[PDB]
Amino acid sequence: AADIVQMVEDLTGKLTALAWALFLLSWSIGWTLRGSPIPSSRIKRVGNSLIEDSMWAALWLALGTTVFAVIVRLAGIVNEVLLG
Amino acid sequence: AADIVQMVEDLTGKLTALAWALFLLSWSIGWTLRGSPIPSSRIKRVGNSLIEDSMWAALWLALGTTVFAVIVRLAGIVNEVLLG
Amino acid sequence: AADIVQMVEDLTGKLTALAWALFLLSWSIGWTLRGSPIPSSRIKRVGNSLIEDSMWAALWLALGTTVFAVIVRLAGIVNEVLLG
Ligand SMILES: CC(C)CCC[C@@H](C)CCC[C@H](C)CCC[C@@H](C)CCC[C@@H](C)CCOC[C@@H](COP(=O)(O)O)OC[C@@H](C)CCC[C@H](C)CCC[C@H](C)CCC[C@@H](C)CCCC(C)C
Ligand SMILES: CC(C)CCC[C@@H](C)CCC[C@H](C)CCC[C@@H](C)CCC[C@@H](C)CCOC[C@@H](COP(=O)(O)O)OC[C@@H](C)CCC[C@H](C)CCC[C@H](C)CCC[C@@H](C)CCCC(C)C
Ligand SMILES: CC(C)CCC[C@@H](C)CCC[C@H](C)CCC[C@H](C)CCC[C@@H](C)CO[C@@H](COCC[C@H](C)CCC[C@@H](C)CCC[C@@H](C)CCC[C@@H](C)CCCC(C)C)COP(=O)(O)O
Ligand SMILES: CC(C)CCC[C@@H](C)CCC[C@H](C)CCC[C@H](C)CCC[C@@H](C)CO[C@@H](COCC[C@H](C)CCC[C@@H](C)CCC[C@@H](C)CCC[C@@H](C)CCCC(C)C)COP(=O)(O)O
Ligand SMILES: CC(C)CCC[C@@H](C)CCC[C@H](C)CCC[C@H](C)CCC[C@@H](C)CO[C@@H](COCC[C@H](C)CCC[C@@H](C)CCC[C@@H](C)CCC[C@@H](C)CCCC(C)C)COP(=O)(O)O
Ligand SMILES: CC(C)CCC[C@@H](C)CCC[C@H](C)CCC[C@H](C)CCC[C@@H](C)CO[C@@H](COCC[C@H](C)CCC[C@@H](C)CCC[C@@H](C)CCC[C@@H](C)CCCC(C)C)COP(=O)(O)O
Structure with a gap:
């Protein structure tokens, strides 16, 4: 009942x-x-995509840990609006 | 009679x-x-689908907890309309 | 669980x-x-791009080692802002 939630949380950690x-x-x-000596352009593009996606995801992880509480709050607000 | 509803609600919780x-x-x-080093595109697509569905369902759960009351209200309105 | 993180860190080092x-x-x-005797201009351009990218990446590597902690701090700040 609760040990399952606990093990899911440990897995997430x-x-x-x-x-x-x-x-x-x-x-x-x-x-x-x-920065390597290779003067190709496709590899510069690959490196740019790598570092950009890295920064993006590194930001969004903890932000999502917050996003779920934000979504719960939005659900509360819309419930209070539609049903007085 | 009522213990069955109670246990169903506990299961839902x-x-x-x-x-x-x-x-x-x-x-x-x-x-x-x-954000992993793998430069494949199919895996980026899978990650996008995962995070999108996660946000979608996380929103819709509590919203549905409200949706059922909304549907009851709509039933009341249509009943009052069709039968004076 | 943790040996995987350890080996990833060794690989990064x-x-x-x-x-x-x-x-x-x-x-x-x-x-x-x-500095070679060749009086071409395309090769001077290639050398300039090489040395510039070298300096750029050499700076940004350790800076990124810091950037990830900076991003964690920004996540903490936005979480504290949105949720009191
Ligand atoms: C890769 C990823 C997939 C995994 C990562 C994480 C992994 C490491 C974890 C693995 C998670 C596992 C596969 C799914 C969890 C199990 C579900 C069925 C829990 C249901 C909820 C559960 C707590 C309720 C507790 O039962 C009530 C007990 C009393 O117990 P108690 O009072 O505590 O002693 O009543 C007694 C019996 C006799 C009651 C009989 C009624 C019967 C049990 C109804 C069925 C419940 C429901 C229809 C199941 C549907 C759940 C799935 C749709 C979700 C699956 C998600 C899956 C994709 C991972
Ligand atoms: C080039 C580059 C690609 C490589 C460079 C670096 C290389 C040198 C390293 C190689 C990295 C390798 C390929 C990926 C790491 C493995 C993942 C699956 C770890 C999952 C996390 C892991 C610690 C959790 C620990 O398991 C819990 C154990 C208890 O164990 P314990 O208590 O310690 O004894 O529970 C027992 C079972 C029975 C629980 C069953 C549940 C089951 C395990 C759930 C699946 C977990 C999850 C869904 C997997 C998804 C992870 C991927 C999305 C990430 C892959 C990244 C990849 C691109 C590199
Ligand atoms: C696609 C990649 C995965 C390819 C990876 C290959 C790599 C793993 C192989 C390892 C190293 C290779 C031996 C690189 C060979 C480079 C060739 C000269 C091909 C040039 C590429 C074509 C398309 C040109 O397109 C780019 C223009 O630069 C010109 C390159 C310098 C400007 C040359 C240097 C100019 C003169 C002085 C070289 C002297 C010749 C020998 C004495 C030197 C050794 C030759 C050699 C053994 C090693 C090459 C060391 C590199 C880092 C200089 C942009 O083209 P673009 O931006 O697209 O418009
Ligand atoms: C489908 C996935 C499930 C596959 C998962 C495989 C994975 C679990 C295996 C673990 C790691 C593998 C050893 C990855 C091997 C990557 C190969 C070079 C295949 C390239 C893929 C083909 C289709 C190319 O398609 C994509 C273009 O990128 C080019 C990749 C870099 C641009 C290369 C890097 C370029 C040069 C400098 C590599 C140097 C060679 C060795 C010294 C390095 C080790 C080689 C090696 C041992 C590790 C590879 C580490 C990766 C992260 C760089 C886009 O293609 P697309 O977007 O589709 O148009
Ligand atoms: C499926 C829907 C029903 C989901 C509905 C959820 C919604 C009801 C929840 C309410 C608001 C949520 C808190 C939205 C959270 C957005 C996350 C950043 C997830 C991004 C989505 C993933 C898949 C990305 O896919 C799309 C790319 O955009 C990037 C989004 C901007 C580009 C970010 C903005 C970029 C930076 C500056 C954000 C700064 C972070 C915080 C300080 C801001 C608050 C964070 C936060 C609390 C509110 C978010 C306010 C939104 C409107 C900016 C396209 O992806 P695609 O077109 O598919 O290829
Ligand atoms: C594209 C590169 C990869 C080419 C690499 C080639 C390289 C690997 C080959 C090795 C050495 C070659 C034998 C170089 C040959 C140079 C030719 C004279 C072509 C001139 C280039 C054309 C486009 C001119 O464009 C540039 C103007 O300079 C003029 C060059 C000096 C001003 C000449 C020197 C002038 C007189 C005194 C030379 C005397 C003739 C012989 C006795 C000498 C040996 C001839 C010879 C065997 C060796 C050449 C030694 C070089 C370093 C001087 C700018 O033009 P731009 O800036 O674009 O507007």
Whole structure:
């Protein structure tokens, strides 16, 4: 009943730690591709996409941890509006 | 007679708690897939679908808790219209 | 659970060492192309792009190591703002 929620939360915590590690790894890979001697352009594009997505997701993770409470508040507001 | 309704409501409550936990887990999985070093596109698509469905359902759950009262009100209105 | 994070961090460390080495190599290649007897202009342009990207990435690597903590702080601030 509740142990299932507890184990789901533990899984989410471990996944979040791994996600921070992987985000840093992706940032490093992107900025390493961008500075290498290879003068290609496709690889610069790949590095840019990597670092940009890394920053984006790293921001949005904790923001989503907040987003769900925000959505609950919006549900409360619309319920109070429609039903007095 | 009434204990059956009570146990159904308890089941719904436990399920709702588990559902919030799983929604947060899905959000984390999606945003982890989106920021990983893998430069594939299918996986970015999967992550986008995950996070979008997560937000959608997280909104619609409590909204539905309201939706059923809204539907009852609509039934009352149409009954009052058709039968004076 | 945690050994996976540890090995990801070790991979990032090795990659960072290699990245510093490659940045120095790219700087050397660029400044060697720029001073060679060849009077072409396209090659001067290539050397300029190489040395500029090298300096840029060499700066941004450690800065990003800080950027992720900065983003976490911004997430904390916006969470505190939206939810009292
Ligand atoms: C990769 C990812 C998929 C996994 C990651 C995370 C993993 C690590 C966790 C694994 C999660 C697992 C697969 C799903 C959870 C199990 C569900 C069925 C819980 C239902 C809620 C549950 C707490 C209710 C408690 O039962 C009431 C008990 C009293 O117990 P108590 O008083 O505490 O002693 O009543 C006794 C019996 C005799 C009552 C019989 C009624 C019967 C049980 C009704 C069925 C309930 C419902 C119809 C099931 C539907 C749930 C699914 C739609 C959700 C599945 C999500 C899935 C995609 C992961
Ligand atoms: C090039 C680059 C791609 C690589 C560079 C770096 C490389 C060198 C590292 C390689 C990284 C590898 C490929 C991905 C990591 C593995 C993931 C699945 C970890 C999930 C998190 C994990 C710690 C949780 C721990 O499990 C809980 C255990 C208890 O264990 P314990 O208590 O410690 O004994 O529960 C027992 C079972 C029976 C529970 C069953 C539930 C089941 C496990 C749920 C699935 C979990 C989740 C849905 C997986 C989704 C994760 C992916 C979206 C992320 C992949 C990123 C990828 C692009 C690299
Ligand atoms: C697609 C990638 C995955 C390819 C990856 C390949 C890589 C893994 C292979 C490892 C290193 C390779 C040996 C690189 C070979 C580079 C060739 C000269 C091909 C040039 C590419 C074509 C399309 C040109 O398109 C780009 C223009 O630059 C010109 C490149 C410098 C301007 C040359 C340098 C100019 C002269 C001085 C070179 C001297 C010749 C030999 C003595 C040097 C060794 C030759 C050689 C053994 C090593 C090459 C070391 C590189 C870093 C200089 C932009 O083109 P664009 O932006 O698209 O418009
Ligand atoms: C479908 C997925 C489930 C596949 C998952 C596989 C994954 C679980 C396996 C783990 C890691 C793999 C070893 C990834 C291997 C990547 C190959 C180079 C295949 C490229 C994919 C094909 C279709 C290209 O399509 C995409 C273009 O990017 C180019 C990728 C970079 C631009 C390369 C990097 C370029 C050069 C510098 C690489 C240097 C070679 C070795 C020294 C590095 C190690 C090689 C290697 C051991 C690890 C690869 C680390 C990745 C993150 C860089 C877009 O293609 P598209 O968007 O579709 O148009
Ligand atoms: C499915 C719907 C029913 C979902 C409805 C949810 C809704 C009822 C909830 C109410 C408001 C929510 C709090 C929205 C949260 C938005 C998240 C950032 C998720 C982004 C969605 C993912 C898939 C991205 O996919 C789309 C790309 O845009 C990026 C969005 C802007 C570009 C961000 C804005 C960028 C930065 C500056 C935001 C700053 C962060 C906080 C300080 C702001 C508050 C955060 C927050 C509390 C409110 C969000 C206010 C929105 C209107 C900006 C296209 O993706 P696609 O077109 O598919 O390829
Ligand atoms: C695109 C590159 C990858 C090409 C790389 C080629 C390279 C790997 C080949 C190795 C060395 C070559 C033998 C270079 C040959 C240079 C030719 C004279 C072509 C001139 C280029 C055209 C477009 C002119 O455009 C540029 C103007 O300068 C004029 C060059 C000096 C001003 C000449 C020197 C003038 C007189 C005194 C030369 C005497 C002739 C022979 C006795 C000398 C040996 C000839 C020869 C065997 C070696 C050349 C040694 C170079 C470093 C001087 C700017 O033009 P721009 O800036 O664009 O407006």
